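During the second year of the project, the team shifted from modelling isolated chains to modelling whole assemblies. The rationale, set out in the original proposal, was that interfaces cannot be judged from single-chain predictions alone. As a representative example for this report, we include one of the complexes processed in the last quarter. Its constituent sequences, exactly as entered into the pipeline, are reproduced here:
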Amino acid sequence: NDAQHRRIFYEAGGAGTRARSLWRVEPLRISWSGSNIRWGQAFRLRHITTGHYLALTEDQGLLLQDRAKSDTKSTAFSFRASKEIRDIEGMGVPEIKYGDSVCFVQHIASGLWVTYKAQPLKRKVILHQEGHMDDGLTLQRCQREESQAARIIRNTTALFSQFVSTLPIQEVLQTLQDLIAYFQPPEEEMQHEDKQNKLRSLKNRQNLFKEEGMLALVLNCIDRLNIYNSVESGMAWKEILNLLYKLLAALIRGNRNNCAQFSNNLDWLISKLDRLESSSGILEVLHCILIESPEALNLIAEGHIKSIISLLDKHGRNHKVLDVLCSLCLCNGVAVRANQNLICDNLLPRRNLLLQTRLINDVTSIRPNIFLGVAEGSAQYKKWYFELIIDQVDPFLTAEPTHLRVGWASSSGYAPYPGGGEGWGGNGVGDDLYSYGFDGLHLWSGRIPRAVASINLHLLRSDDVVSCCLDLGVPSISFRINGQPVQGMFENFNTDGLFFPVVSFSAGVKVRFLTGGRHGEFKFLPPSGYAPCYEALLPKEK
Amino acid sequence: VNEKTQYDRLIPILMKSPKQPDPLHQIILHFSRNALTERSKLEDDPLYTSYSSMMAKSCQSEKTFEEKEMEKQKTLYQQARLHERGAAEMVLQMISASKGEMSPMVVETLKLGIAILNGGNAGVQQKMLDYLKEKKDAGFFQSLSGLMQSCSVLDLNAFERQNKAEGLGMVTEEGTREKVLQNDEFTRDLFRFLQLLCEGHNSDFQNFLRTQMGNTTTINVIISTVDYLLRLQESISDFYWYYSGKDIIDESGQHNFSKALAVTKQIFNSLTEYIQGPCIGNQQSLAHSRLWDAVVGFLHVFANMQMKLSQDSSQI
Amino acid sequence: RCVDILELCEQEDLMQFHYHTLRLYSAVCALGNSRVAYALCGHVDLSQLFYAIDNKYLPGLLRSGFYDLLISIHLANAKERKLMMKNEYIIPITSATRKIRLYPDESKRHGLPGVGLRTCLKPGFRFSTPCFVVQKQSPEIPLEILKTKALSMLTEAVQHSGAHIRDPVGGSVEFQFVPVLKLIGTLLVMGVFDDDDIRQILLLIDPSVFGEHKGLLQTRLPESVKLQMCELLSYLCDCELQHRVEAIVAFGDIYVSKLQANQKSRYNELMQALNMSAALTARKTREFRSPPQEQINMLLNFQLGENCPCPEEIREELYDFHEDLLIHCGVPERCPTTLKELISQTMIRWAQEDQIQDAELVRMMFSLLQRQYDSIGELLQALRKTYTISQASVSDTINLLAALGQIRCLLSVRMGKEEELLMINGLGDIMNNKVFYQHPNLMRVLGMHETVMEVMVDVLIAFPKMVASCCRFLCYFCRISRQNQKAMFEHLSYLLENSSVGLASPSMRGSTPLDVAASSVMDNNELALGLEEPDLEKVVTYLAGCGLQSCPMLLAKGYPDVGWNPIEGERYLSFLRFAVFVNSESVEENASVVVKLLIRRPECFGPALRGEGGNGLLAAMQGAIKISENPALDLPSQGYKEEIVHMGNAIMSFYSALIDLLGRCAPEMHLIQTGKGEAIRIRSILRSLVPTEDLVGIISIPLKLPSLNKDGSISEPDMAANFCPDHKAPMVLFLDRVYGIKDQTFLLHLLEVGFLPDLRASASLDTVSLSTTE
Amino acid sequence: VEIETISPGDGRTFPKKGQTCVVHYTGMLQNGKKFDSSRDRNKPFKFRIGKQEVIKGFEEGAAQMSLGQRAKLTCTPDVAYGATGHPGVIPPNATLIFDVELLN
Ligand SMILES: [Cl-]
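Output from the structure prediction step:
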């Protein structure tokens, strides 16, 4: 797409290791075309990463020309031993040597010489009649991996450029899978020297692909795919997008230079975190960048951290997000204070993403074997009464307030277990809708307290007598403390199941049940119509 | 006390028989594995420096025929103790991993290679050549060329500044006096190692140091030696022309001259080891080089300094 | 809802998420983030941490994470501060200093490592209660329940450590032992344990070597437990080294007192000699006129024989102490008796019994093995960083050490703004301390300049104030002493590498790395002869770059494009002036090198002296005066937006600094009178550069001076925007040094046109109102 | 700042200005999320009235409570560090609940 990619230069510094300096020498023959090149033999020079041929164009001078216009008269160059003026059927005789012979490139249809135009160190290359005295060139053969990578670069560039712009979907899929297999890291069980050799080759190929602008090409392909997908075929499109993210991750994994180059697209990468299908690949690419490139941590802003935290909030509890945040906090033993402060201020105080921990007291419930029911045509009395004396309570025994609640529980669903449960555990009377409890200050039902006024209100302390009254007819539940009535009650609850007195507590309490008769004399007079609970016992029971 | 009791008995304890590798083999393999890891730069490793120093000290420990033969057998046993545990390959790997940059690790690596190669140990030479031809390690020769190109010659400007400072009544430190010909011990060690590779007319290594067949790149070590010899000869000519018009030579000039002559003697011995046997390829490489210009300059310096120094009794 | 934490023993996904949550908790408070640690105390408190470290049914990853979280919140910062200030041994001379003995008794048996009195200046750590109502470094922790709990947990882990046990805590032996050993090592480095606790730890490690007259080291262990044991043994080695250093210092104090008494007695005997010989008295007076270090060297060198004035008893005492020190260091089968033998046998047995698969364990094992056979070398390295102070200098030193510790704790932090203010205040507190400018050797032993250089390198940029404070500190450090100047001169190449920073801002003069590079060579003739041609060539390359293109910082602010940068060029010329001229005499080699480099790149000379188009020096100065007269050229246009840089005065200052540098590059007259060819060549080049007519014309330029108004006011012109008398002093210096005044007619011409108007102008400013103006 | 009487005390002795008050507290959010407790570290809190060290709600509750009185204090977000609450623990504009017992 660049208009000046067809010009030819003598460049020094880094250009001798790239894939743009690679030319194929192609003799003008089909049989024995892999044989020795002689002095004065015609050939074409093909540029590997573009596919163009060195030529004497009609309008301009020395230039790269398309293959469709590269006739023999335009593209014909020979190596001469000096500027001092057959096709045999075999391997021939070796004449031109790598690294030793000094070759003068001469155009054949014109007789001109490949010279440099007289002026970084970047000389324009022209064709001149006379030339200079240092026009000679030295040939150096490249490795097989470099030339293979350069041809793969040309083919992939052509395919992705026609994809960015019917479209060869299967060719794109096969190319993406082949490229992902091409940048595959060596297995961990490999021998150390072979593993290091394969890592060296992989790093060289990653550098070669980065130097030809393949990362930017993959980014433009991803942008074009997102534009197409925003506006089956959709399954193929999302598969190609997933393979593109895998290719990007494989291209930048383990290479510091590629990640440092890619750190400029941090806003783009963070902004593409909203989508469900693209989230895992973006997260993998981001983690590779944060592990390798150290300046990407400097480039991280507050909005990026909030986007990552919102990804954690909207996608579930994934620990790879936590790994990304950990990588954001430290890089190679250096702590970034801004990232630490932003993570602490935007992740911790909400207390709804991370699992919480605490130390809680264990709570147990104790009941007498007194069960009260309501049924049609039943010989069961409906008004019942009992009392509880608190001999000793030690609040803050275990740095947590001592649980102590007393009341009525229904056998329909009141099944407290020690340990976990609803809320923060420690489930007692009033922590579900089957128990109705009093703690001295509040009324508890459904694990929701309601503060209720009373004469000299306080928590259940020592020498306190709590009287509980249950009227199953209405139904209603009322409490009294030291004879003083508590100004609150429970009503309109389910009368199914059996009702029993219950006390729930943590450690550090001493209480006594009084049910009347020979099972505890009441310290206060029961209300009118309310029977003591000991009358509910069967005659053949204790 | 510290210059005598340091690392006094650790090497026999490491190899003392009570894992198939012994502890010394394990630490050598650890250093080899660190050297083989692909890195951009050889980072500083004090552990390698200390252990390679103690290995080189372990190897380096008239007369009758029996006494000389027992000394040779003792040296062979001490070198076998190290090279049967992979020390020669480790030396080559550390030289390759230096990337042509001088460091204390390079210094101790060359000293250890000299210690295991001393006396022209043919087994160590065979192991080193087998490793270099099996692995096709062009980085070793690239690093050798880079290390040879960074060797220093006589510095006349630094000598003049030192003389001015000494004339202004200032006592010069050792580091200041070691700036005229800096790191000459490293230069002598490098060319001694290159000489010991070819010792005994080992024609395979003699041909391999010239052209490395099978490798991607080829470095001609002989021509690099000639290039450093030419630079050193030019520096010695400059020093002579500094001292040509003076009746006497002071102690600093004699000290720097002695250092330069020691380095030149090592380089001449290295070239003689390259070409003896004879090696036709190395002889033709030396003939088509810049050796003759160095010979002409050295002949000029030899004649004039011979006539100059014969006339005084303080320059014997 | 909630479950038990032990129900994570089977829920793998929630366990992994909570383990990485604990890792993130450790990460957000890493490297002394105290505010985040106080915030974290409101999520996991001390009761939870104690429960989690005591619990045995917890999963191994959760147990490790809870131990790591406890160390990170409460113990990591104190351990880091102890580890930073551990390679220096600052010992005051008290009565308790003498009490340190090499051996605990006369039986010549080693004492336990880490047990005993320590005479060293190790500053403590500050803790405060994590109260969210109403902060001092790490959050508070009892540290007495914790160490007892750690000792009990280690004892219980060692007791239930058979190979047949099928329920190790955490699921493996590694999960059982590694967190406990990390906690034990963290509390050991912090100095929490007392002597009985260290004795319990040593009995748990090896009850035979550290007995009163099995262990952890004689059991089949995983490699992580071996790593933790290697760290513990390295700490024990450090304790033994510190004990040896303190014993050496105590014996040195006693020996110094004895030597002082003996020399006093010998001097009294010498001065009481009625008929002493002249030669013996002269030799004794020459011995007693030596510097005190020379006196100590003469007293201690026993190889001098009769020349050493030390009596036999003191020599016997020093021989006995040297023998005891060499025996104690292990310098001259059976079960081990000392720590060195135990460590050597343990490392050899570990490497023989198994092939170690972890590279870090191989490195730690062989480092610990090598340092057992390098006791004298480590003792020498420790003694190089050992310093001895007095009682009255203790407390300030402590404050100084605390400040230095804080700066080191900011070497691993990426530029916190609160940390930046803390570092600026720490540098200010160090510069105001009496020990800083009264004990420069202590500051060089502590390596303050290297730490500040590391900070400045890490910043280099976006933080001009930190770099300015670092540069002011380094310049004052150079100005304190000559040895400090040499120490900072050792870093001149890196100072000159990043020397194009802050030169455009006029408020940062004296606060740039170029100023630090200048201060390390200022008026030091030894160090100025130590300069290298690549350094001066780097400065000349910067100057040539300044003479070609305009300053982007000044071009952004709307200043006219004059085509070159005369603001930073003056700074490079000032550095070159400091390089070529030391103590009222030019350095001939530096001057010749600088002149050669300047004439090889004539764009350093500016647009006036470029040749083939350059108008000239006097024409340049007149053009700069015209620029200063025009506000459109001198200043940016109004509306384009603490000290403005006037362009005319900048051009004048550049040319004045260039003429000053070239006039200080002239050879001295004693070089010319000897007929040296190089001096004649340099003076000829300097004469060809600047003609006499330009110098006389610049000297003859009239000045603008304050006057008295008719209303009685004083009208002082702006001296930062006008031609100044300080722009004429380089012209006079160049005319005197390069050309010289040897003819009467030239002197009278110069007096008539240049000097007499200036003399009359200064005489006319001798009114009562105008005399005290700048 | 409403005050609930969990357990009444003497009702006569009250803290004054410049006198240290040794109290035990338990600070939690309005949603039931505990953040501070002096009883977990077994270190009672000591502060002097009149120096405005504690927040306005805590000071008002300490002034209103008698000796040996345990009470619940509801601090509005205006007096709960304003909209600039303690980051990492207390979110901005949050109502705080304290369970304060005056030991001395
Ligand atoms: Cl091709």
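Chain B is about 70% helix and 0% strand. The CA atoms of residues 231 and 285 of chain B lie 18 Å apart.
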